[PDB]
Amino acid sequence: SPASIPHLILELLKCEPDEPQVQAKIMAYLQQEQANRSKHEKLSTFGLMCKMADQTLFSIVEWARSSIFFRELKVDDQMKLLQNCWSELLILDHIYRQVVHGKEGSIFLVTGQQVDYSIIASQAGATLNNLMSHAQELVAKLRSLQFDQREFVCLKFLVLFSLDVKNLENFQLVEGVQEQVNAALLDYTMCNYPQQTEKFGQLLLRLPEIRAISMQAEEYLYYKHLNGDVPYNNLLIEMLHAK
């Protein structure tokens, strides 16, 4: 942590989840699910990766519900904000994980497991390959910018407290959060990365790329689901079909 972090960002950071704990819990659920299945009821790699993404989304919702500002909204408003941004938060989570824990050529998973990009290149279809090609480049850009945890938590709030959401009772609090977080991120980047005179603007430019990736991920999930490749009802699927 740098010597200089804005008070608002300090408060956002307090709300962060305990990474080592999230990783363990997820790795356990996953194992038990695959055990005690006959040959023709055993889960595919896709089914396991789906349950993994589902449990990560549970963790994201658990983060949001106890978070500063978000916790001040009524449940109905909370539902609307999360339905608007769920896939973007999953994508942002994945991308930041690659920046912190990942290395060139390999994808680091929430369980601490890893798979090489080259495996996907060979084996996967066109939708997942395009998806992964764009995510890999976004990670590469963020590594170049020296994207850090302070900036990461600011982006999470900017994605969550979106101005594009209609029918909120307390739309005012949402505007307030967006204004305050934008201002703190700009102060933070100018202070701590002064050689990068454009870092704030460059970080904001990544948000439309995050949105584009999460939409193609939704499309990918949708087709897999309607092909029968999704094991049971889960939060992922609920969010996919909502609104």
Partner: peptide, 15 residues
Amino acid sequence: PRQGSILYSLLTSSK
């Protein structure tokens, strides 16, 4: 009404 809502369940548990 979608009583089956997992998201609603998670949110109502914190309010």
